[PDB]
Design a protein around this ligand. Structure first.
Ligand code: DMA
Ligand code: DMA
Ligand SMILES: [Ca+2]
Ligand SMILES: [Ca+2]
Ligand SMILES: [Ca+2]
Ligand SMILES: [Ca+2]
Lengths: 344, 344
């Protein structure tokens, strides 16, 4: 359960914090801020996928130290979110201020010298760096103490892949926005790395790798995550354009305001080339620019006008059905087929 | 030898780059930029300290995979330098442009959209992040394939300490400058984490931990690094104030221009309180501010006027002698006593 996975990470963070007390109260406040960020909210979706990858292949429920290994994905996710807020220059995340604004406010509260925003950015870099090195220390610690050497090697390869692919997905995304990549292929490649592999496939394989040597199941979870991950992305693309702010927690047409290069936006350009070339020109010359609220509503209606919203929904229903068809015929326990079908 | 340690890291980086080719030519260019930065210069000082910590306790020269483990300190150092250049907002490093300026120039070369400086900062964050996750993958890989399980646990604890202390030292340093910490104690605590532990003590213990279980030697290398590391810092403090730009590679009085909170600067304030209170007031009200070249020269002369330079030199000679006295009476091989005395 997510609660048992979070409590394992809570105790670990407490232990690392006590061991670092000799470095002063200022660094202790940064560690406490890391605790408040990781534990103070989240769905725990990635450790749950790792839990089912373990159940799909194993019989005994994982040891408590293995749940700590699954929680490392949550601490690793904090590193990604903290650095992503600097990359996106976001001021808030899920209603709470981002790291660079919390430490800039601390700078002003203490009447410190220099640029508060520069201190906030520097501290946010270090905050994300700490979440990464500590999330990795979990994997190294749990592997040496709780896993047979062959499970250690299988776990490390997944750990090396999930961090290499989330960094590649991040760099591919900023290059795609800077280069104005229109193609569905460019947006799909980012979604495969940032969403399919990072959220679904690699977490699933992390639990399977720790359980036993089942290359057949790991290769199947990759195809299962390739469909469910993209279906998750297209759902977010629709919510990012048409979602009600009372459900998404984000402004109306946020993806259009922020200028994301999404699959939905990319497919709207392709469908518009075939139905109204002037609507494709309206999309091309407006994506990623400073858009008023009226421009955003017009683009939202154009996206649904060319059938991009309906094309996305059918693409979601198809991928979700195939992912469940892949899950029903898998050589795994019927308990994981149920749990993973629930999440899907 | 540093050359054999670098060539191990060169082959590893090449292998990781080839394995990541499926993520496109843009990410491949970032990995090639990482190769050019880590391999295209450096003294390899930290892997050498790790080499002598191995020799001090062991008899057989380390395996080639162990030299790769020692090279992980160099790749980890790239992560620290890349993120430090963002923290310090530096434009060049050792005559070459920093990461945020290389990727901003790429942005302008490609006539890309948006802020080039924001893309450069975002790419620099990701570049440093990649150096860290790959430097850690070396440790995880070498431990599972080349070390007995007890050496793995000893290596991991040093790996967890060196990364936790360089992050704490970085945060303590920006807090010290923002809060205008005058005390020698504040500057010394930063020097112990950033220089003593990160450069000397923890690298030494990394090689000793991989060789055998010698808690006696590891505790001695900590005291040896506590003296040699601070002596290294005070030498840099003197060069940062009085050094010839033709030898330091940095402008005259760079520490005063950049506003570093060094031990030398802190001791100058204490000595001035006892000899000329108005000179201490001149230091206090000028450190960390926008200083003209005449203000810098005046502060340089005041620092030597109150005897802070002479006090630093005697403090360097004392620590260097004690570190060699600690090294001569150590229960280690006479080969490492020679090699480590050379570096000192
Ligand atoms: C690596 C990672 C999880 C990035 C977040 O994606 P995003 O920037 O599109 O959205 P948000 O900042 O809202 O999570
Ligand atoms: C963590 C680390 C090695 C920081 C560099 O020290 P610095 O910022 O005082 O100097 P430089 O940028 O010249 O290396
Ligand atoms: Ca982003
Ligand atoms: Ca973001
Ligand atoms: Ca610095
Ligand atoms: Ca610097």
């Amino acid at each position: 359960m997510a609660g048992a996975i979070t409590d394992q990470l809570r105790r670990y963070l407490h232990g690392r914090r006590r061991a670092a007390a000799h470095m002063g109260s200022d660094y202790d406040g940064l560690i406490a801020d890391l605790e408040d960020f990781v534990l103070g909210g989240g769905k725990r979706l990635r450790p749950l996928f790792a839990y089912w990858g373990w159940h799909a292949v194993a019989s005994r429920e994982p040891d408590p130290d293995v749940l700590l290994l699954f929680s490392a994905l949550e601490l690793l996710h904090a590193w990604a979110l903290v650095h992503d807020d600097l990359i996106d220059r976001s001021a808030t995340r899920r209603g709470r201020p981002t790291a660079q604004l919390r430490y800039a406010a601390l700078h002003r509260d203490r009447d410190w010298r220099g640029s508060p925003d520069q201190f906030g950015m520097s501290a946010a870099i270090l905050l994300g760096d700490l979440a990464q090195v500590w999330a990795d220390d979990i994997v190294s610690k749990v592997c040496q103490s709780a896993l047979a050497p062959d499970a250690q090697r299988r776990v490390h390869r997944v750990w090396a892949d999930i961090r290499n692919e989330v960094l590649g997905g991040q760099y591919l995304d900023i290059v795609a926005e800077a280069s104005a990549a229109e193609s569905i292929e460019s947006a799909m490649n980012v979604a495969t790395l940032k969403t399919a592999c990072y959220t679904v496939s690699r977490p699933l394989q992390l639990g399977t790798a720790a359980a036993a040597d089942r290359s057949d199941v790991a290769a199947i979870f990759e195809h299962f995550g390739a469909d469910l991950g993209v279906a998750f992305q297209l759902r977010d693309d629709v919510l990012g354009v048409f979602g009600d702010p009372a459900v998404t927690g984000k402004p109306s047409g946020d993806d259009l305001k922020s200028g994301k290069r999404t699959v939905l936006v990319a497919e709207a350009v392709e469908l518009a080339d075939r139905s109204d070339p002037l609507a494709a020109k309206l999309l091309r010359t407006s994506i990623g620019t400073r858009l008023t609220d009226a421009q955003v509503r017009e683009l939202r209606t154009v996206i649904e006008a060319v059938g991009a919203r309906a094309a996305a929904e059918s693409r979601i229903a198809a991928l979700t059905q195939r992912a469940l068809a892949t899950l029903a015929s898998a050589p795994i326990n019927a308990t994981a087929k149920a749990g993973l079908s629930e999440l899907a």
